[PDB]
């Protein structure tokens, strides 16, 4: 319900100064032909380079994440959905741990990720976007809340 471009405009204010972000995308997720071109348009619009690494199985997760970190030096990890591989505990755990140990915040699709260490997720209420934040991790990572959302932010 929060579109990819809305999400990336939020990320710009949540981690100000970010210039490069990595997306781990499940090759078996629905809507690739919509989402992946939208991410490139979101990149041009926000000024944040978006690098996508696609994965189909758990053995692809580690090598594809390392490519995001060493080849592209991304500054955060962004996960857009969790219907399949990215809803499995082992993939979630691996991605949060390795992002965090590289100094990267994780922007995540659901509160399950926050319960495990991701920083921010989002929802769309009748009054618009509302932010859900892992207070402990977000404070450590230097996450900043845009003024418009100061009153529309819940802590896990």
Residue numbers in the entry: 27 to 182
What's written in the study?
Typical SBP proteins recognize a substrate using two α/β domains, whereas the single-domain substrate-binding protein from Rhodothermus marinus (RmSBP) has a single α/β domain. The crystal structure and flexibility of RmSBP have been established, but its molecular function is unknown. Recently, radiation damage to the selenomethionine-substituted single-domain substrate-binding domain from Rhodothermus marinus (SeMet-RmSBP) was investigated.
Therefore, the diffraction intensity and radiation damage were not directly comparable, and the diffraction data were collected from a single crystal by rotating it 360°. The diffraction data collected from 1, 2, 3, and 4 X-ray exposures of SeMet-RmSBP crystals were designated Dose I, II, III, and IV, respectively. For the Dose I dataset, images 1–6 were missing. Accordingly, the number of images for Dose I deposited in ZENODO is 354, and the number of images for Dose II, III, and IV was 360. Doses I, II, III, and IV were 1.46, 1.56, 1.63, and 1.70 Å, respectively, showing improved resolution compared with the previous report (Doses I, II, III, and IV were 1.50, 1.58, 1.68, and 1.75 Å). As the X-ray exposure time increased, the negative electron density map at the Se atom site of SeMet concomitantly increased; however, a negative density map for other atoms in SeMet was not observed. The results indicate that the Se atom is more sensitive to radiation damage compared with other atoms.
